[PDB]
Every structure is written in structure tokens, then in C-alpha cells.
Scaffold this active site. Structure first.
Site, PDB file in Angstrom:
ATOM      1  CE1 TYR A  75      -3.326   2.906   0.651  1.00 60.53           C
ATOM      2  CE2 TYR A  75      -4.604   0.891   0.803  1.00 60.53           C
ATOM      3  CZ  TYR A  75      -4.542   2.257   0.635  1.00 60.53           C
ATOM      4  OH  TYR A  75      -5.700   2.975   0.449  1.00 60.53           O
ATOM      5  CG  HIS A 212      -1.785  -2.280  -3.208  1.00 64.90           C
ATOM      6  ND1 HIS A 212      -2.131  -1.731  -1.992  1.00 64.90           N
ATOM      7  CD2 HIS A 212      -2.387  -1.515  -4.149  1.00 64.90           C
ATOM      8  CE1 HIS A 212      -2.913  -0.685  -2.189  1.00 64.90           C
ATOM      9  NE2 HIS A 212      -3.083  -0.532  -3.490  1.00 64.90           N
ATOM     10  CB  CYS A 213      -3.412  -6.345   0.914  1.00 62.89           C
ATOM     11  SG  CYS A 213      -1.935  -7.337   1.198  1.00 62.89           S
ATOM     12  NE  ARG A 214      -1.159  -3.121   7.491  1.00 66.63           N
ATOM     13  CZ  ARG A 214      -1.691  -3.385   8.678  1.00 66.63           C
ATOM     14  NH1 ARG A 214      -1.555  -4.597   9.190  1.00 66.63           N
ATOM     15  NH2 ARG A 214      -2.355  -2.463   9.353  1.00 66.63           N
TER      16      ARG A 214
END
EC number: 3.1.3.48
Length: 278
Positions: A75, A212-214
């Protein structure tokens, strides 16, 4: 036996040593570094492979597992937003799947700019958000979808389709549906660039799905694994090959939790796909 506890143990055995050797050292030449003190890695031990880095000021990697070419990143921070939109524009992003839940985005102790649900100006670049459809993926897990329009003075105006997963055994059937939605969303936008004869269809480093997540090593490595298993060209590609190529091209933390590997294992058992390399 091919998917029993013995083969699963040999899998996690060959993978846990790869993670340990790909663990980064202080100022590691295999990994991207931050110059000037500008923070680059959201987490201290989750870095970016320099040989496959997309941009110098992003924790992002070009990832080709088998024949599937994608882009996995973290992120973006607030300081990385201006260059993050430049990556999405230059790449001619056919799909952007963000897997961070709506809860952690609003939690400002995590520092995740809501850059796709809002509008705003990020230096040279103006961003316009427009929500489209909501896609149900079972279990009440929802996919809010937006059209991120990206406009810079003198640059081509580029809109990217966004797939936002608001939450996170049935994850096998949820990831299979999410990977399908991401693939079909990318195909429509990629076919659009083809109808207008874009220069970026020839470039294989472009038109890459952005996921993407984190940290970009957890839920995304699970999504990327299902996307390439969905691909027709990746036949007989072992799960060992899948996650080892993800780890060598980004970092050893790809497929982080043991439950994320189990989702990739069962998806392979449904396809009769091998786990280990002979």
C-alpha cells in the site's frame, strides 16, 4: 499421498528455507534501498527486489509466475502517492485489485491514504474517482469497483479499473471468484487498448495487473497464485514453482501465513496440479 501430509511437509520445508535465505540484510544488494531518508518500506523486514523493481521510489515488483505477468506492491504511503499514480498510468493498468479491508484503511494508525475512493491532487497529478458496480464473491465478501481516472498536464489521460475487497476454507471458492473477476476486468480494459492500437500492448512490462493489500506479500500472494492457476498457459506449473518465483522476484515473505499456502494447495488439488518439482 501427492497432496497428503508428507508432500505438504516437503513443500513447506523447501519454502521455509527460501524465505530464510531471502531474508534481507542491512543494506542488501538484492533489495531496493531508500536514499535521503525518505521511507520506502512500510515494514522493516518486508523489502523489494531491486532487479525486478518497478520504480525506484516504490515498494513494487514486476512479477511473472509461469506466463502470468502482474505487478505486486505494498500500500503506498502518503509520500509515495504521486509516483504511485505514475506507475498505474505508464503501465496502462488494466486492473488494480486492492485487498486491504475498508476497516484498516480508515484506521489512520496504519497510514493508508484512501487514494482510490476519493478525488484529490497529488502534486503534478489530479485524480478523479467514480464508483461503478458491486460484485459479490460469496460469504458476504464484497467487491466495490471504481474507475480511477488519472490526468496530468501534458500526459495522456488514463483510467484504470479498480477492484476493492472490503474484508478478509471457503476462501478457496472466494479467491477463485476474485481471481476470475480480476482477470475478466483486466481483459475488457486490455481489449480496449487493443482496439485503439496502443503502443503498450507490445511491451510485456506494461498492461500488468496491479495487486496490493498492505505489505503485498499476504493476501496478494494468495490472489496472484490463483490468477496464474486460472491462466491456461500455466500447465504442470508446480506450487513450488509458483511461490518460489513470487519470492525470488519480490521477497521471501510472499505467501506469508500457512493458511494462505493451504488455499493455493487445495486449488492445485482441484486442478490435479503438482505441488513439488520432481
Amino acid at each position: 499421498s501427492p497432496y497428503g501430509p508428507e508432500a505438504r511437509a516437503e513443500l513447506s520445508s523447501r519454502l521455509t528455507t527460501l524465505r530464510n535465505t531471502l531474508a534481507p540484510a542491512t543494506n542488501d544488494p538484492r533489495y531496493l534501498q531508500a536514499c535521503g531518508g525518505e521511507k520506502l518500506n512500510r515494514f522493516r523486514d518486508i523489502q523489494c527486489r531491486r532487479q525486478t523493481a518497478v520504480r525506484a521510489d516504490l515498494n513494487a515488483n514486476y512479477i511473472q509466475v509461469g506466463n502470468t505477468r502482474t505487478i505486486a506492491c505494498q500500500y503506498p504511503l502518503q509520500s509515495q502517492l504521486e509516483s504511485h499514480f505514475r506507475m498505474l498510468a505508464e503501465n496502462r493498468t488494466p486492473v488494480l485489485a486492492v485487498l486491504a479491508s475498508s476497516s484498516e484503511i480508515a484506521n489512520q494508525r496504519f497510514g493508508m491514504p484512501d487514494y482510490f475512493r476519493q478525488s484529490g491532487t497529488y502534486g503534478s497529478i489530479t485524480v478523479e474517482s467514480k464508483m461503478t458496480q458491486q460484485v459479490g464473491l460469496g460469504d458476504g465478501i464484497m467487491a466495490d469497483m471504481y474507475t480511477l481516472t488519472i490526468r496530468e498536464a501534458g500526459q495522456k489521460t488514463i483510467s484504470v479499473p479498480v477492484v476493492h475487497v472490503t474484508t478478509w476454507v471457503v476462501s478457496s471458492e472466494v479467491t477463485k471468484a476474485l481471481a476470475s473477476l480480476v482477470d475478466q476486468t483486466a481483459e475488457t480494459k486490455r481489449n480496449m487498448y487493443e482496439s485503439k492500437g496502443s503502443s503498450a500492448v507490445a511491451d510485456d512490462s506494461k498492461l500488468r495487473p496491479v495487486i496490493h493489500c498492505r505489505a503485498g506479500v499476504g493476501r496478494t500472494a494468495q490472489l496472484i497464485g490463483a490468477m496464474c492457476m486460472n491462466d491456461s498457459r500455466n500447465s504442470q506449473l508446480s506450487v513450488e514453482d509458483m511461490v518460489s518465483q513470487m519470492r525470488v522476484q519480490r521477497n521471501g515473505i510472499m505467501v506469508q501465513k500457512d493458511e494462505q499456502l493451504d488455499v493455493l494447495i487445495k486449488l492445485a488439488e482441484g486442478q490435479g496440479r503438482p505441488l513439488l518439482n520432481s
